[PDB]
């Protein structure tokens, strides 16, 4: 979203495995919106059915 702000890959979206990533592209930082029912951190496992 908007390559100054965001662009970020979703297959490993830079830092979570099942996420949908806020790459803050200036900063250098990729952090996630887990996908639909997964859990987080970095984003691995499925909501609850880890």
């Known amino acids: 979203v908007v390559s100054h702000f965001n662009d970020c890959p979703d297959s490993h979206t830079q830092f979570c495995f099942h996420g949908t990533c806020r790459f ?13 029912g997964y859990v987080g951190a970095r984003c ?5 059915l880890a």
């Open 24 to 36: 803050l592209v200036q900063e250098d930082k990729p952090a996630c919106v887990c996908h639909s």
């Open 44 to 48: 691995e496992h499925a909501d609850l």
